[PDB]
Amino acid sequence: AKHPVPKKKTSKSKRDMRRSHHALTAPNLTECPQCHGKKLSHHICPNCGYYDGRQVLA
């Protein structure tokens, strides 16, 4: 059939214990010095399109 296969149902503890590293990491947010709405570091502020001056439209 399917050459290598599992030997027992992996317990609720053991199965969950594995997901101990699946913990999503929330973005490190900074507020734009202009338009004042959050933005990700080293990127352009979504709201105005500023990044010292204005680059992107709307």
Annotated binding site for Zn(2+): 32, 35, 45, 48
Closest to RNA by CB, 33 or 37:
37
Closest to RNA by CB, 4 or 53:
4
Instruction: Concatenate the DSSP letters of all residues of the chain into one string.
Output: --SS--SSPPPHHHHHHHGGG-------EEE-TTT-SEEETTS--TTT-BSSSB-S--
Closest to RNA by CB, 1 or 29:
1
- Residues paired with 38 in a beta bridge: 31
Q: Which residues bind RNA (CB under 7 A)?
A: 1-3, 5-9
Minimum distance from residue 32 beta carbon to RNA (Å): 20
